[PDB]
Write a protein that binds this DNA or RNA. Structure first.
Ligand SMILES: [Zn+2]
Length: 252
DNA sequence: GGTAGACAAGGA
DNA sequence: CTTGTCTAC
């Protein structure tokens, strides 16, 4: 899921788990557990803690408990659901947190790409994987100046810069293409080639694009089809990855 | 020290 | 194939 989907998960999962006490943690694919490295220590330390909150950083969910934070990335297709301990597990359930009220927080992930790190709360933000994360796109910390400062230090594509989690948190592929389109900038352009009016436009389209999604696509997945503004066939190439979609006329 | 590819996997 | 980032050069 993209940042807006994760924020939707954050918001809807929280009431379903807040104030619940962990009685057991069950793990069926231990590699999902990245810290502590031993999954039995991961399970043991969680037990007896009550869930107090749920926050989001980039595409990371941060479950806040009594002493610890659980940092969770869904990556490709992880999913959480709350359900009764009396029901059979859905397929591809790899981690289950059992609550004292007989309900469960279940983590499913067909790919098994998702990760989990548990640290003392105070430590979470200065450890992998939150440590080097860039500012939230929708916050004051992510500004034209911050974006300007990074662009002018590197020769790589403006798309590659924006996909860099240290520049800005959780800006997905779909939103990079869309934002660049709306700002009229080519995804393959060197970051250091952008004018200051250009970075200000990009910054402002980044915030609007991600901001509308949080609360109708122009280029993403639309290759071969008429651009919605000028009617020029949308084109698809490879930039910093990765499927890159753009209009050759609208974007410069 | 600055940046990709490497790397995690089960199904078309 | 299909994705996100942080470890590896
Ligand atoms: Zn166009």
């Amino acid at each position: 899921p993209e940042l807006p989907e994760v924020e939707t998960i954050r918001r809807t999962l929280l009431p379903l788990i807040v104030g619940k006490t962990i009685e057991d943690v069950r793990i069926f694919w231990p590699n999902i557990i990245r810290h502590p490295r031993d999954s039995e220590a991961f399970a043991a330390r969680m037990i007896g803690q009550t869930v107090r909150g749920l926050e989001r950083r980039g595409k990371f969910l941060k479950f806040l408990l009594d002493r610890d934070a659980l940092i969770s990335h869904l990556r490709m297709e992880g999913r959480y659901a709350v359900a009764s301990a009396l029901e059979p597990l859905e397929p591809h359930t790899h981690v289950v947190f059992c609550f004292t009220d007989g309900s469960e927080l279940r983590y499913r992930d067909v790919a098994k790409f998702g990760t989990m790190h548990v640290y003392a709360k105070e430590e979470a933000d200065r450890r992998p994987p939150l440590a080097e994360l860039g500012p939230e796109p929708l916050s004051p910390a992510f500004s034209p100046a911050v974006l300007a400062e990074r662009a002018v230090k590197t020769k790589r594509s403006v798309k590659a810069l924006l996909l860099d989690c240290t520049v800005v948190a959780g800006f997905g592929n779909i939103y990079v293409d869309e934002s660049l389109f709306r700002a009229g900038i080519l995804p393959g352009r060197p970051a250091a080639s952008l004018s200051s009016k250009e970075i200000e436009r990009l910054h402002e389209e980044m915030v609007a694009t991600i901001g509308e999604a949080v609360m109708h696509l122009y280029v993403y997945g639309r290759q071969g089809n008429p651009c919605k503004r000028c009617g020029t066939p949308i084109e698809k190439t490879v930039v910093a990855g990765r499927g890159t979609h753009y209009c050759p006329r609208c974007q410069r």
